GROMACS .gro file of C-alpha atoms in nm:
model
  286
    1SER     CA    1  11.887  10.899  14.856
    2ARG     CA    2  12.060  10.855  14.520
    3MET     CA    3  12.401  10.703  14.441
    4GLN     CA    4  12.384  10.847  14.088
    5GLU     CA    5  12.381  11.204  13.966
    6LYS     CA    6  12.040  11.352  13.882
    7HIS     CA    7  11.949  11.247  13.527
    8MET     CA    8  11.838  11.473  13.244
    9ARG     CA    9  11.528  11.378  13.042
   10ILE     CA   10  11.604  11.360  12.673
   11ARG     CA   11  11.332  11.331  12.407
   12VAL     CA   12  11.439  11.125  12.107
   13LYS     CA   13  11.230  11.167  11.794
   14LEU     CA   14  11.248  10.841  11.599
   15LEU     CA   15  11.229  10.796  11.221
   16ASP     CA   16  10.860  10.697  11.236
   17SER     CA   17  10.795  11.027  11.422
   18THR     CA   18  10.722  10.858  11.754
   19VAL     CA   19  10.904  10.999  12.058
   20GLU     CA   20  11.089  10.798  12.322
   21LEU     CA   21  11.216  10.942  12.651
   22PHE     CA   22  11.563  10.860  12.783
   23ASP     CA   23  11.694  10.956  13.126
   24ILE     CA   24  12.070  10.997  13.142
   25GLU     CA   25  12.339  11.155  13.358
   26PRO     CA   26  12.440  11.479  13.185
   27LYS     CA   27  12.810  11.395  13.232
   28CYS     CA   28  12.784  11.071  13.034
   29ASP     CA   29  12.949  11.057  12.692
   30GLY     CA   30  12.712  11.061  12.394
   31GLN     CA   31  12.772  10.689  12.336
   32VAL     CA   32  12.569  10.605  12.647
   33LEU     CA   33  12.257  10.761  12.491
   34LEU     CA   34  12.336  10.624  12.145
   35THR     CA   35  12.356  10.270  12.286
   36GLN     CA   36  12.031  10.306  12.484
   37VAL     CA   37  11.865  10.410  12.159
   38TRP     CA   38  12.017  10.123  11.960
   39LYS     CA   39  11.887   9.886  12.229
   40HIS     CA   40  11.539  10.034  12.237
   41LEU     CA   41  11.530   9.979  11.860
   42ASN     CA   42  11.726   9.656  11.843
   43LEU     CA   43  11.927   9.824  11.568
   44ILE     CA   44  12.209   9.592  11.462
   45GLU     CA   45  12.348   9.802  11.178
   46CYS     CA   46  12.365  10.103  11.408
   47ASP     CA   47  12.699  10.226  11.265
   48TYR     CA   48  12.508  10.395  10.981
   49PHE     CA   49  12.309  10.608  11.224
   50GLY     CA   50  12.336  10.900  11.463
   51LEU     CA   51  12.134  11.141  11.672
   52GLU     CA   52  12.112  11.504  11.568
   53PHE     CA   53  11.982  11.824  11.722
   54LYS     CA   54  11.905  12.168  11.584
   55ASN     CA   55  12.117  12.454  11.716
   56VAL     CA   56  12.016  12.817  11.772
   57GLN     CA   57  12.154  12.893  11.426
   58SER     CA   58  11.888  12.647  11.313
   59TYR     CA   59  12.126  12.396  11.151
   60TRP     CA   60  12.151  12.027  11.241
   61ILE     CA   61  12.448  11.895  11.435
   62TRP     CA   62  12.548  11.538  11.526
   63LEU     CA   63  12.578  11.410  11.882
   64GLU     CA   64  12.944  11.318  11.944
   65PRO     CA   65  12.991  10.977  12.109
   66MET     CA   66  13.305  11.067  12.309
   67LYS     CA   67  13.197  11.398  12.461
   68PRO     CA   68  12.965  11.458  12.759
   69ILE     CA   69  12.604  11.506  12.651
   70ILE     CA   70  12.530  11.811  12.865
   71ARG     CA   71  12.823  12.000  12.707
   72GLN     CA   72  12.671  11.938  12.362
   73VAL     CA   73  12.299  11.988  12.417
   74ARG     CA   74  12.297  12.247  12.701
   75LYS     CA   75  11.926  12.220  12.780
   76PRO     CA   76  11.897  12.024  13.108
   77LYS     CA   77  11.518  12.054  13.114
   78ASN     CA   78  11.428  11.958  12.757
   79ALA     CA   79  11.695  11.825  12.530
   80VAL     CA   80  11.546  11.697  12.203
   81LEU     CA   81  11.737  11.492  11.947
   82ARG     CA   82  11.626  11.290  11.647
   83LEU     CA   83  11.736  10.963  11.490
   84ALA     CA   84  11.888  10.998  11.145
   85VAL     CA   85  12.102  10.816  10.893
   86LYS     CA   86  12.455  10.959  10.912
   87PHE     CA   87  12.624  10.753  10.641
   88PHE     CA   88  12.446  10.690  10.309
   89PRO     CA   89  12.601  10.394  10.123
   90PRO     CA   90  12.567  10.362   9.744
   91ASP     CA   91  12.354  10.042   9.763
   92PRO     CA   92  12.132  10.053  10.072
   93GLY     CA   93  11.927   9.764   9.932
   94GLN     CA   94  12.232   9.558  10.027
   95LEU     CA   95  12.206   9.644  10.397
   96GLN     CA   96  12.192   9.317  10.592
   97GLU     CA   97  11.860   9.357  10.776
   98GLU     CA   98  11.509   9.429  10.658
   99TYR     CA   99  11.478   9.656  10.963
  100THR     CA  100  11.771   9.873  10.853
  101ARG     CA  101  11.622   9.902  10.504
  102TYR     CA  102  11.293  10.003  10.667
  103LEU     CA  103  11.470  10.281  10.861
  104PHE     CA  104  11.644  10.400  10.543
  105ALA     CA  105  11.310  10.421  10.361
  106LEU     CA  106  11.176  10.631  10.652
  107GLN     CA  107  11.483  10.856  10.631
  108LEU     CA  108  11.431  10.909  10.259
  109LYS     CA  109  11.064  10.981  10.328
  110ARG     CA  110  11.176  11.251  10.572
  111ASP     CA  111  11.429  11.395  10.325
  112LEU     CA  112  11.157  11.417  10.061
  113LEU     CA  113  10.917  11.592  10.303
  114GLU     CA  114  11.189  11.832  10.420
  115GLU     CA  115  11.278  11.915  10.057
  116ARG     CA  116  11.633  11.780  10.087
  117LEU     CA  117  11.579  11.494   9.845
  118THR     CA  118  11.473  11.658   9.522
  119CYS     CA  119  11.375  11.487   9.197
  120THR     CA  120  11.130  11.512   8.910
  121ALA     CA  121  10.757  11.535   8.982
  122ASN     CA  122  10.684  11.186   8.853
  123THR     CA  123  10.971  11.038   9.050
  124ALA     CA  124  10.856  11.203   9.373
  125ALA     CA  125  10.505  11.069   9.311
  126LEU     CA  126  10.645  10.723   9.244
  127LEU     CA  127  10.848  10.728   9.567
  128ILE     CA  128  10.542  10.832   9.767
  129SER     CA  129  10.333  10.560   9.600
  130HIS     CA  130  10.575  10.294   9.728
  131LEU     CA  131  10.575  10.454  10.072
  132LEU     CA  132  10.194  10.425  10.068
  133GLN     CA  133  10.216  10.059   9.967
  134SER     CA  134  10.447   9.988  10.262
  135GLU     CA  135  10.237  10.173  10.519
  136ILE     CA  136   9.872  10.129  10.422
  137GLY     CA  137   9.894   9.848  10.165
  138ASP     CA  138   9.701   9.801   9.842
  139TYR     CA  139   9.547  10.100   9.671
  140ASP     CA  140   9.197  10.213   9.747
  141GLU     CA  141   9.091  10.559   9.641
  142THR     CA  142   8.921  10.651   9.967
  143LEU     CA  143   9.189  10.497  10.191
  144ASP     CA  144   9.466  10.677   9.999
  145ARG     CA  145   9.293  11.016  10.001
  146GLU     CA  146   9.212  11.002  10.372
  147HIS     CA  147   9.567  10.893  10.453
  148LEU     CA  148   9.718  11.171  10.241
  149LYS     CA  149   9.498  11.426  10.417
  150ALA     CA  150   9.630  11.330  10.759
  151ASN     CA  151   9.991  11.246  10.661
  152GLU     CA  152  10.234  11.477  10.485
  153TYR     CA  153  10.486  11.344  10.232
  154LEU     CA  154  10.564  11.665  10.042
  155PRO     CA  155  10.467  12.030  10.073
  156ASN     CA  156  10.180  12.095   9.833
  157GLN     CA  157  10.147  11.720   9.782
  158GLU     CA  158   9.792  11.782   9.660
  159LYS     CA  159   9.944  11.892   9.329
  160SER     CA  160  10.066  11.538   9.273
  161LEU     CA  161   9.770  11.348   9.418
  162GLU     CA  162   9.655  11.206   9.084
  163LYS     CA  163  10.003  11.082   8.991
  164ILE     CA  164  10.051  10.930   9.337
  165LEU     CA  165   9.721  10.737   9.317
  166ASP     CA  166   9.793  10.629   8.960
  167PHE     CA  167  10.132  10.479   9.053
  168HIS     CA  168  10.002  10.320   9.375
  169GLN     CA  169   9.745  10.121   9.174
  170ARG     CA  170  10.040   9.946   9.007
  171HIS     CA  171  10.178   9.803   9.332
  172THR     CA  172   9.901   9.553   9.403
  173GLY     CA  173  10.010   9.284   9.648
  174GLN     CA  174  10.359   9.418   9.722
  175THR     CA  175  10.486   9.366  10.075
  176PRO     CA  176  10.630   9.637  10.299
  177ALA     CA  177  10.983   9.494  10.246
  178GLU     CA  178  10.938   9.497   9.869
  179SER     CA  179  10.807   9.852   9.887
  180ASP     CA  180  11.100   9.972  10.099
  181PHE     CA  181  11.338   9.808   9.853
  182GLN     CA  182  11.182   9.999   9.566
  183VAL     CA  183  11.211  10.327   9.759
  184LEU     CA  184  11.583  10.257   9.811
  185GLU     CA  185  11.632  10.157   9.447
  186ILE     CA  186  11.470  10.474   9.315
  187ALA     CA  187  11.636  10.705   9.570
  188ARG     CA  188  11.992  10.575   9.544
  189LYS     CA  189  12.019  10.692   9.183
  190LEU     CA  190  11.913  11.049   9.264
  191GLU     CA  191  12.185  11.312   9.258
  192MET     CA  192  12.054  11.441   9.591
  193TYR     CA  193  12.056  11.099   9.765
  194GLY     CA  194  12.213  11.150  10.109
  195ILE     CA  195  12.307  11.511  10.027
  196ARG     CA  196  12.315  11.793  10.284
  197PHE     CA  197  12.443  12.133  10.172
  198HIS     CA  198  12.689  12.347  10.363
  199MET     CA  199  12.704  12.698  10.222
  200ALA     CA  200  13.045  12.832  10.124
  201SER     CA  201  13.238  13.048   9.879
  202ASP     CA  202  13.537  12.953   9.662
  203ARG     CA  203  13.860  13.138   9.577
  204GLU     CA  204  13.681  13.363   9.325
  205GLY     CA  205  13.407  13.442   9.578
  206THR     CA  206  13.143  13.236   9.401
  207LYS     CA  207  12.871  13.109   9.634
  208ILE     CA  208  12.862  12.728   9.629
  209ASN     CA  209  12.721  12.438   9.830
  210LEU     CA  210  12.962  12.187   9.981
  211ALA     CA  211  12.859  11.829  10.048
  212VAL     CA  212  13.013  11.491  10.118
  213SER     CA  213  12.925  11.140  10.000
  214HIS     CA  214  13.063  10.786   9.986
  215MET     CA  215  13.249  10.904   9.673
  216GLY     CA  216  13.422  11.212   9.813
  217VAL     CA  217  13.381  11.582   9.875
  218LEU     CA  218  13.133  11.750   9.648
  219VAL     CA  219  13.076  12.100   9.515
  220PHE     CA  220  12.738  12.225   9.393
  221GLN     CA  221  12.665  12.564   9.243
  222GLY     CA  222  12.309  12.625   9.346
  223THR     CA  223  12.156  12.283   9.282
  224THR     CA  224  12.403  12.188   9.009
  225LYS     CA  225  12.695  11.959   9.089
  226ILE     CA  226  13.015  12.110   8.956
  227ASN     CA  227  13.293  11.903   9.119
  228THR     CA  228  13.359  11.566   9.277
  229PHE     CA  229  13.682  11.535   9.472
  230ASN     CA  230  13.702  11.157   9.487
  231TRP     CA  231  13.854  11.008   9.800
  232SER     CA  232  14.135  10.853   9.599
  233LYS     CA  233  14.257  11.204   9.511
  234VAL     CA  234  14.220  11.354   9.857
  235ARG     CA  235  14.544  11.357  10.056
  236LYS     CA  236  14.427  11.557  10.358
  237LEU     CA  237  14.132  11.754  10.494
  238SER     CA  238  14.195  12.046  10.729
  239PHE     CA  239  14.020  12.354  10.860
  240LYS     CA  240  14.134  12.688  11.000
  241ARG     CA  241  13.873  12.922  11.143
  242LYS     CA  242  13.619  12.971  10.859
  243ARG     CA  243  13.845  12.810  10.595
  244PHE     CA  244  13.799  12.451  10.476
  245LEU     CA  245  14.113  12.306  10.311
  246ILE     CA  246  14.129  12.009  10.074
  247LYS     CA  247  14.475  11.880   9.982
  248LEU     CA  248  14.436  11.716   9.640
  249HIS     CA  249  14.617  11.631   9.315
  250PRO     CA  250  14.807  11.945   9.206
  251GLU     CA  251  14.703  12.164   8.913
  252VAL     CA  252  14.893  12.094   8.590
  253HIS     CA  253  14.916  12.440   8.434
  254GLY     CA  254  15.030  12.670   8.713
  255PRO     CA  255  15.282  12.714   8.995
  256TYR     CA  256  15.252  12.404   9.208
  257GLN     CA  257  14.929  12.414   9.408
  258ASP     CA  258  14.789  12.111   9.590
  259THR     CA  259  14.525  12.276   9.809
  260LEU     CA  260  14.176  12.413   9.744
  261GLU     CA  261  14.016  12.651   9.992
  262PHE     CA  262  13.650  12.721  10.066
  263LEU     CA  263  13.512  12.978  10.308
  264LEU     CA  264  13.216  12.874  10.523
  265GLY     CA  265  12.991  13.102  10.726
  266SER     CA  266  13.156  13.053  11.064
  267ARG     CA  267  13.433  12.865  11.240
  268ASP     CA  268  13.187  12.618  11.388
  269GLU     CA  269  13.009  12.553  11.056
  270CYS     CA  270  13.348  12.497  10.898
  271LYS     CA  271  13.454  12.263  11.181
  272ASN     CA  272  13.130  12.068  11.156
  273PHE     CA  273  13.172  12.016  10.781
  274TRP     CA  274  13.532  11.909  10.832
  275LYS     CA  275  13.419  11.659  11.096
  276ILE     CA  276  13.155  11.493  10.876
  277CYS     CA  277  13.401  11.473  10.586
  278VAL     CA  278  13.666  11.304  10.798
  279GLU     CA  279  13.403  11.065  10.933
  280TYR     CA  280  13.280  10.981  10.580
  281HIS     CA  281  13.631  10.911  10.463
  282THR     CA  282  13.695  10.681  10.760
  283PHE     CA  283  13.361  10.501  10.713
  284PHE     CA  284  13.385  10.440  10.339
  285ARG     CA  285  13.760  10.416  10.283
  286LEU     CA  286  14.033  10.182  10.408
   0.00000   0.00000   0.00000
């Protein structure tokens, strides 16, 4: 006999791609699972992190700490979630623990592989060369080529093999911590560092990509950044159905207007973007 409810088995894909299994009562709030994961990892700076899952609409959503797990994931038999950085600070090299910096380097590795973190060809190759130094150590042509055959860093990485090898040869003797630090140093200056797009349209019907960062709410047209609504200028964030509302400094040359509106693809996509913006503001401001 059991004095607890039957537990659900949840697979958690970690940042190194290993999978750990966690058994939890479906009615438990997300925090229960989050804390088991932080313990398994001995992750001190856990406030930067979350667990995410992919919905039927194929987009990633964050596990909420104060809602029952079963109501969020819905799959009693095989819930799968993955560890991810939620909050990207401007200077991750200044994170307090080597372990946290290690996890951030792994996150950036994933964002490069998944084509979220974009950059010039040489810069991508340089990033990968430091990732190689951290994982397999000093350059050797055979060791590098065999590793790159069995481990993916970028789609069509073979195009950049020569550049990757060339840069790796420069990193002789560098430790994994040094290598992670270099990954963070290179990545943090990239326009796409920590960026996840949420598709929307503006007042004129132009298709844009919304994002949020430690600096504020961001607007991209295609891949080009066209606005930064800095937190200091943001008075309120709201949403109604598919509409995302930013209350901001008013326009100078027009009848008084303090609010910009963007239309997302659905109520829930809108709500999810609103949520991450509010969370970013709380994390990085006051």
